[PDB]
């Protein structure tokens, strides 16, 4: 061997530690919801449960457009209408019914306690809900979608989660014992975030993506 | 309606400007590591450090050519390592761009690159001879001058593609957001994409590592 031995082997066992080409590995795509707040200063619902605007509808065509071909064996919600709304055009092409958790919903914020919302600094975290709760309840919910989904006897079983950007944000940074602000990211509307699970290991395999929205206006 | 909605709503456009969304003036690069190299490595021929792609590989690269073939893409750039510059190919011959090479996209010197053994590293422990600070900083600057290279858009966002590599564009995205080695624990899977936005000097990550392309292919491909 000139070195390719060492190098392949050592390859291989990176892959493994992340649950790449390992067997029994399945899949669950975090995505966060439509877009809900075009025009919602003028919308007649409740403004903090609202449904998906125009916009919303089409990114969220976008999305199921997407995700048509990939195999999905389960779709899970938050009770939110905007994220039902989202999860039930991905459900309708793979014939499923979406099934709702609300320890999926976004974090309690200030405008949930009737206070003004704030524009914190970079690394303040600006919610009441604290991030060890959120993180506790998302991990559980997450688990449970994975433990409900029979394994699919073809390829990667996979399940979709449908919910909000500050949850699951917390959710990716506690797998990598980050804590809020250092994945200093905000998820796209309708992005697609991917973990990794095998047992009691839960890899951040993939986060943020809204690249469906590229090609439109 | 003065029940919160509208402070709500302005907050969430000043967190949404801080990431660079909603500005005018913002570039997308699209990082892409390159595709698979290293099937029936033990047995190539070849420049072992720098090599073609494998079968494997020019499938994966199909993928990706076809789901980036709608995407407006107005440059193509890559590593002057063949696996980067022939994917990168697959994906500029979709958009009639030629690619252009950037040798400080190349992958993190190796152990492997010095004629040493190869040793796997508990998590955390910076597994490179090329220091991270070094790697980090050429990504930037490679990224950077790949814009101020790119005519902007006339219609819409301007977006460079730049097919690169994995450890040392893990290390671009971790220092972007004050990270080092270890922090964003992650490896990106070959032909992912990861999205940066990019506004003058200044550059957020967007998105990391998603081979999504790649969730129904066979075994022959995966
Ligand atoms: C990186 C990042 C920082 C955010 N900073 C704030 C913030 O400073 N104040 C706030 O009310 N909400 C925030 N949020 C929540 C967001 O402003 C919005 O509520 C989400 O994008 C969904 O509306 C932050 C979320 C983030 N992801
Ligand atoms: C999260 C992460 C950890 C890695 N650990 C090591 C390592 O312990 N030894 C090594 O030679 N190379 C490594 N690497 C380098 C990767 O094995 C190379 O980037 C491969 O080409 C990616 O498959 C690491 C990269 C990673 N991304």
């Given at each position: 061997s000139d070195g390719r031995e060492s190098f392949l082997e050592v390859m291989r066992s990176v892959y493994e530690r992340y649950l790449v080409?390992?067997?029994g590995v399945s899949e669950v795509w975090l995505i966060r919801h439509a877009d809900?707040?075009?025009?919602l200063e003028d919308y007649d619902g409740d403004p903090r449960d609202p449904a998906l605007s125009e916009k919303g509808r089409a990114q969220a065509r976008l999305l199921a457009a997407r995700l048509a071909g990939v195999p999905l064996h389960g779709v899970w919600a938050s009770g939110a209408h905007r994220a039902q709304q989202t999860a039930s055009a991905v459900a309708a092409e793979h014939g499923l019914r979406v099934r709702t958790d609300?320890?999926?919903?976004?974090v309690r914020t200030n405008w949930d306690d009737g206070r003004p919302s704030e524009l914190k600094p970079h690394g303040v975290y600006p919610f009441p809900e604290p991030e060890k709760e959120v993180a506790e309840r998302m991990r559980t919910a997450v688990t449970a979608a994975v433990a409900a989904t029979p394994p699919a006897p073809d390829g990667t079983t996979r399940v979709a989660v449908v919910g909000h950007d500050s949850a699951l944000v917390i959710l990716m940074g506690s797998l990598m014992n980050l804590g809020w602000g250092q994945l200093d990211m905000i998820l796209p509307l309708t992005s697609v975030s991917v973990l990794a699970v095998k047992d009691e290991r839960m890899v951040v395999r993939s986060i943020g993506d809204a690249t469906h929205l590229a090609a439109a206006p």
């Open positions: 080409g390992v067997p809900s707040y075009t025009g609300a320890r999926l919903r976004e």
